[PDB]
Design a protein around this ligand. Sequence first.
Ligand SMILES: *[C@@H]1O[C@H](CO)[C@@H](O[C@@H]2O[C@H](CO)[C@@H](O[C@@H]3O[C@H](CO[C@H]4O[C@H](CO)[C@@H](O)[C@H](O)[C@@H]4O)[C@@H](O)[C@H](O[C@H]4O[C@H](CO)[C@@H](O)[C@H](O)[C@@H]4O)[C@@H]3O)[C@H](O)[C@H]2NC(C)=O)[C@H](O)[C@H]1NC(C)=O
Ligand SMILES: OC[C@H]1O[C@H](O[C@H]2O[C@H](CO)[C@@H](O)[C@H](O)[C@H]2O)[C@H](O)[C@@H](O)[C@@H]1O
Ligand SMILES: OC[C@H]1O[C@H](O[C@H]2O[C@H](CO)[C@@H](O)[C@H](O)[C@H]2O)[C@H](O)[C@@H](O)[C@@H]1O
Ligand SMILES: *[C@@H]1O[C@H](CO)[C@@H](O)[C@H](O)[C@H]1NC(C)=O
Ligand SMILES: [Cl-]
Ligand SMILES: [Cl-]
Length: 312
Amino acid sequence: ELCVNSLEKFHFKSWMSKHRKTYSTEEYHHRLQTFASNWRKINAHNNGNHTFKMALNQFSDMSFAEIKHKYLWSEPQNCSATKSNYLRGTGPYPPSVDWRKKGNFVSPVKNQGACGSSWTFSTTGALESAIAIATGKMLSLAEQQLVDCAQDFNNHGCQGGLPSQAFEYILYNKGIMGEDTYPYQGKDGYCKFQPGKAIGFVKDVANITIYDEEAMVEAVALYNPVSFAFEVTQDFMMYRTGIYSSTSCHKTPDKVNHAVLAVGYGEKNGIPYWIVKNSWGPQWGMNGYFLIERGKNMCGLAACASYPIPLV
Ligand SMILES: *[C@@H]1O[C@H](CO)[C@@H](O[C@@H]2O[C@H](CO)[C@@H](O[C@@H]3O[C@H](CO[C@H]4O[C@H](CO)[C@@H](O)[C@H](O)[C@@H]4O)[C@@H](O)[C@H](O[C@H]4O[C@H](CO)[C@@H](O)[C@H](O)[C@@H]4O)[C@@H]3O)[C@H](O)[C@H]2NC(C)=O)[C@H](O)[C@H]1NC(C)=O
Ligand SMILES: OC[C@H]1O[C@H](O[C@H]2O[C@H](CO)[C@@H](O)[C@H](O)[C@H]2O)[C@H](O)[C@@H](O)[C@@H]1O
Ligand SMILES: OC[C@H]1O[C@H](O[C@H]2O[C@H](CO)[C@@H](O)[C@H](O)[C@H]2O)[C@H](O)[C@@H](O)[C@@H]1O
Ligand SMILES: *[C@@H]1O[C@H](CO)[C@@H](O)[C@H](O)[C@H]1NC(C)=O
Ligand SMILES: [Cl-]
Ligand SMILES: [Cl-]
């Protein structure tokens, strides 16, 4: 039990108003305790020496158990694979890449809501980018179609799934509709796929060999953004800026629980990093993005990377 000071109390009242919360007296006391515990963790972290900072955001009054249940995948996915098809060529590669800078090649940051559907945003993001790079047209593709319709490829809607499996679904389904015709609901619904309204199509799926992080570097440098999955832990939820790293996340395929999109890479103060688009809205992290340490299979990010070749 924490003794909450007036500074924390006043800021929680502001946070509740900003995030449109209503709590009973009883739940309020519990939510305040969680908020104050996270407040102290953020300050303890930022007051020390680390490569990234933490901050308040929409997750600040949630326990990590609640966050896992609502926002992350509910069970291990079939990330481990003994077969792959991507074969890396030869470096060196450019010292830095950022597909947001090369042109209009990365779609805006979206919000998955309280649904474990990050695999769908990783998938649409990678395919949106691949189509924009190939044809110069930026589309917004329907994550909801993947949530509702991709179960024959071992995906599980709001309980989880994998980008490579979702790319295969789009290939054999003969395409994916736009957000405009198939809006995102943040919950599992009936499949409403209409063949004549598909606007995005997959020709091939590239699966990067397990732990082949240097192939991810080549793919981002030469071809396009790359979907990947990693293990989110408690302190990642509170990431604000800088280069994320952790000594407590696992690095194995059976522990990854969130999928995202690598859109570039770089280095700061001798620390290599990935530039990564998330799906928790544009005010999480660095305008919806984060940096994560590169070259260490950090949090298992090289366990099951993949990207699509579009049919255009
Ligand atoms: C990269 O990683 C992904 C994800 O793990 C792997 O995805 C698998 O990809 C294979 C193709 O390589 C997929 O298998 C194909 O599925 C198609 C759809 O199957 C459904 O529909 C048919 C009827 O049309 C049903 O019979 C079936 O039960 C399903 O309901 C099939 O149409 C394909 O069949 C064709 O190929 C097979 C042999 O491959 C022949 O037997 C057939 O006659 C036909 O020619 C095929 O089965 C599979 O669904 C994907 N799995 C998942 C979980 O997504 C990639 O393989 C992987 N790539 C590499 C290189 O590692
Ligand atoms: O979200 C928790 C539930 O997930 C599954 O149910 C959802 O997904 C089904 C398709 O996989 C939909 O048919 C169902 O309508 C959704 O609620 C799971 O089947 C449930 O047991 C979980 O409670
Ligand atoms: O053997 C399983 C481990 O493979 C990877 O680590 C090896 O390969 C890396 C480059 O892909 C090297 O940097 C690392 O030094 C090697 O140990 C993977 O990163 C590890 O998590 C796996 O355990
Ligand atoms: C993994 O693949 C196996 C074999 O196809 C399947 O039975 C199982 O449901 C899959 N697991 C998940 C979490 O998709
Ligand atoms: Cl520098
Ligand atoms: Cl910033």
